[PDB]
Amino acid sequence: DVTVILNNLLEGYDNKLRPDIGVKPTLIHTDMYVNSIGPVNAINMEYTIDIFFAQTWYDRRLKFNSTIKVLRLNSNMVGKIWIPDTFFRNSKKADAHWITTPNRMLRIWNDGRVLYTLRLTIDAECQLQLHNFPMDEHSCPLEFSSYGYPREEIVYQWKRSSVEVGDTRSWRLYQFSFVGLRNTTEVVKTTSGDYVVMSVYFDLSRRMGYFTIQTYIPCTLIVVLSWVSFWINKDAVPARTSLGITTVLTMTTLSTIARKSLPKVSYVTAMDLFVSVCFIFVFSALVEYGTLHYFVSNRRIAKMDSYARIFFPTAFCLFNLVYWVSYLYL
């Protein structure tokens, strides 16, 4: 009884023709369930995402009159009926799933409504404004639309529950915390025509736990250690010189991780500004002793250590006051 219904629906059917091709635009209602948001790759400016993509539209050619209300079908009928050519506009690489069978579902109601769902894994490009790193926040988008059908042919619209997520604790976000998400609608003009574009924006804020312990605190300690020489006597040339140049070597070693997981962007991130200023302070402390040693011994001038005992901590605390307020509250 169901075999006859399926056979009759495809009799005299052309999957190459849009439903109501010369009547009105085909309205497609889209629903998305985000299984997981994969790691953000700042080097490649992209993120991974696994979703359940559901599209709903009406196809008058698939109306069937019977006691059955809906035909719950597997993926073998996807290639027999017309399917929207929905593609993700910022997907660098995306793929469906085929284990153990194609991860696709097709349900057809008696009034011609079709529900088409498939599981997708998408690597979507995301342009990261890496200023203020590692105190940076991003809204990585996910845009999809039809490929060949303009706004006069295919129109997309979100459902009452557009995007659903899971528990957010099974996700693979290493560097970021998921803040929130938003969905928008827009029409984009191209040479082929005007297209309806659906967009989802995932707002991500970078977690700062690693950078404080690994980078900020050690760099602060090295700068404080370089201030020790201001209390060592000026006659202890081997002690102050070795302390000054070894903190420079330590600061150079620490400076090698300021730009490690991020691309070779040529603007100064917040992490690089802090490391560079720390390198200047330890550089200036060693130069401070060199100036003091030359003028005192090798011919106010002789009170440089007393001035540097207060000026260096004051200027470093003043720099930290400006630095942390600007990137956290400004």
Binding site: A54, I99, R119, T121, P134, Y174, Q175, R207, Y210, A239
Partner: protein, 343 residues
């Protein structure tokens, strides 16, 4: 001859778009897993590899046959023309259905219309890791699977035997470098989605991270560097170059060790247990150099005591530091290893 004839008639009037017993009963699938090799686990990707012989059994009443034989083996061309469950792994990322040298699949039909469906797969599933306890972390990596298109009212999954006896892991195949497979927990359930309710089968593999490598590579070198910094408390206060070089080079050594240890861990942005231990070790080595700067501030005469005038007494800061620093560091180790190893 008879074997050929039954195969020709086996799919006459057969619609593979309809699940068996549609409109009469829910399709019952008895699953069965044989883990050949619980493959490598990637901390940097939060995913694990597993090699299994995934089995599924159900009844297709339309495929009953009469003949001298009792079991029919179907080739891959005919197996693709027969309805099979649309089983998928919920947490799988990119699995492989092996095709060498032929499709590693086998469909067998019993006389009463019972189908046994076996396939060899390399499932690359996901495992959500919370590495706050790293390297003393334990994880329960799941393997959830079920039907994609059929809700619980159409296709139902169950384990063929008792759930603990349905996932059989190979004794030889463990393939874990930094984990120990304590055991697996097997259970089923129902999940809720916008498209209905689905039967889900879960299998959790419990992994305990091995710590011996991290003790010798990170913890022991960091502990000994903290000891060397406190060794400076016994050097005489008049050896300013020696005590200065001792302090800064230990800080440089700690910095060298801190970077190396962090480079081994996956790039998470939250502080782990190893991060706190190194941070505290960084504080002790920092404080030892600060301690000498205070001792040197109250040193009066440059010369030290000779073999046989006034001479500097032993610093009270030095004498108390010889006790406070080792005792505080020993206290910190007692709290640290009790908090993370007793969980």
């Amino acid at each position: 001859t008879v074997f050929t004839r039954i195969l020709d008639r086996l799919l006459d009037g057969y619609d593979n778009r309809l699940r068996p017993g549609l409109g009469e009963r829910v399709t019952e699938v008895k699953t069965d897993i044989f883990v050949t090799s619980f493959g490598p686990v990637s901390d940097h990707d939060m995913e694990y590899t597993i090699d299994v012989f995934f089995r599924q059994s159900w009844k297709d009443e339309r495929l009953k046959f009469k003949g001298p034989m009792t079991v029919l083996r179907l080739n891959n061309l005919m197996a693709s023309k027969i309805w099979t469950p649309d089983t998928f792994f919920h947490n799988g990322k990119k699995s492989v259905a092996h095709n060498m040298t032929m499709p590693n699949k086998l469909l067998r039909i019993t006389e009463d219309g019972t189908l046994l469906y076996t396939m060899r797969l390399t499932v690359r599933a996901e495992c959500p890791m919370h590495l706050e306890d790293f390297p003393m972390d334990a994880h329960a990596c799941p393997l959830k699977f079920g039907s994609y298109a059929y809700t619980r009212a159409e296709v139902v999954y169950e384990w063929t035997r008792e759930p603990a006896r349905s996932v059989v892991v190979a004794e030889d195949g463990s393939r874990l470098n930094q984990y120990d497979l304590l055991g697996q927990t097997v259970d089923s359930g129902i999940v809720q989605s916008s498209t209905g309710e689905y039967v889900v089968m879960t299998t959790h593999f419990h992994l305990k991270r091995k710590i011996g490598y991290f003790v010798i590579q990170t913890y022991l070198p960091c502990i000994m560097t903290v000891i060397l910094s406190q060794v400076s408390f016994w050097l005489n206060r008049e050896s300013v170059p020696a005590r200065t070089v001792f302090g800064v080079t230990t800080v440089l050594t700690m910095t060298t060790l801190s970077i190396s240890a962090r480079n081994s861990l996956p790039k998470v942005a939250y502080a782990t247990a190893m991060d706190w231990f190194i941070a505290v070790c960084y504080a002790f080595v920092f404080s030892a150099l600060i301690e000498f700067a205070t001792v040197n501030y109250f040193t009066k005469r440059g010369y030290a005591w000779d073999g046989k005038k006034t001479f500097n007494s032993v610093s009270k800061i030095d004498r108390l530091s010889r006790i406070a620093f080792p005792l505080l560091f020993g206290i910190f180790n007692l709290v640290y290893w009790a908090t993370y190893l007793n969980r």
